[PDB]
Amino acid sequence: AQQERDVRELVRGVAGLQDEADPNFQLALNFAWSNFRFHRFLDVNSHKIEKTIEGIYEKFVIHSDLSKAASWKRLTEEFLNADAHYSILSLLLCLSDSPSNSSYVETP
Amino acid sequence: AAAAAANLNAVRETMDVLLEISRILNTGLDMETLSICVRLCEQGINPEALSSVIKELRKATEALK
Amino acid sequence: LECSWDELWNKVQQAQDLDHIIAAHEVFLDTIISRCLLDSDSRALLNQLRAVFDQIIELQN
Amino acid sequence: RATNAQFDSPEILRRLDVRLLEVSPGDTGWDVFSLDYHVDGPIATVFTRECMSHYLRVFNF
């Protein structure tokens, strides 16, 4: 119920749609369900995420960006304060990266 | 009351650390996409399942260009 | 890499203490950090040097 | 083995070997590359791992 609307809001959000009678909506809705119910995935290891965060942090250090590294370690240790933490993190990590950019903090 | 909006305070705070993490990794996501993906991750879904979806619809809206 | 190796080579080959050898390697490394654009104050100079890499890859096209 | 690098003791030669940083979902080879030097003797106490971090930053530059 909340699950079904979330899939609608996810497809409206990413594809930039609002209307639900566009055939491209219906293909993308059905693709989402068929992805979700066809399982070939793994399950997240919290330890694998903790190594990944540590690994990215050295990558930022090694490319001589201390201010991006010092943010990134800080943001991740503050974020890991209260499972679902690890899941959204693994989500955001895998979704995309090509990051080597400076990306200075705004007011955070 | 007070503790029920202070609960809305402590979630928007973690929503703000997560949005800062979102841009420094250079992801195309934003707060609107992220507010759905928090609710999905609460219900229990693979992060490998959500991301394969997003990697399609973000790639299928470039063909609608 | 010729001054920094010089000072390190000297302050090893004379010294009779392992502590002196350790504290020589430490400072040799930190001098290399200071001589290059590897400080936290020198970020703007590093940005300009990043900006000298743009036209390099532009010139190939 | 093909070039002058071979003229070395096998320990120091073996102790130079590559390591890669953690891969991002999009990459090139010039972004992800490292040599990692491992020291296993008691002499690791003068060549501690935090100086290897510095050495590798220098190598990156």
CA B12 to CA B16: how far, in whole Å? 6
Whether the CB of C36 is below 8 Å from some CB of chain D: the reply is yes
Q: Are C46 and C37 in contact (CB under 8 A)?
A: yes
The three-state secondary structure class of A11 is helix
Q: Is C29 in contact with D51 (Cβ distance < 8 A)?
A: yes
The three-state secondary structure class of D17 is strand
Nearest to A75 by CA among A43, A97, A106, A96: A106
Point out residues after which chain B has a gap (C–N over 2.5 Å). Answer: none
The three-state secondary structure class of A57 is helix
Q: Are D25 and A97 in contact (CB under 8 A)?
A: yes
Query: Going by C-beta distance under 8 Å and a sequence separation of 6 or more, which residues neighbour residue C43?
Result: A67
Q: Are B22 and B30 in contact (CB under 8 A)?
A: yes
CA A101 to CA D31: how far, in whole Å? 12
Helices B31-43 and B3-24, packing angle to 10 deg:
110
Nearest to D15 by CA among D47, D50, D57, D58: D47
Rg (CA), chain A: 18
CA D25 to CA D32: how far, in whole Å? 12
Question: What residues in A contact D22, CB-CB < 8 Å?
Answer: 52, 55-56, 59
Question: What residues in D contact C27, CB-CB < 8 Å?
Answer: none
Q: Are B24 and A72 in contact (CB under 8 A)?
A: yes
CA distance A105 to chain C (A): 15
Instruction: Compare CB distances from A92 to B21, B32, B64 and report the shortest one's residue.
Output: B21
Query: Going by C-beta distance under 8 Å and a sequence separation of 6 or more, which residues neighbour residue D36?
Result: D17, D18, D19, D52, D56
CA C52 to CA C21: how far, in whole Å? 38
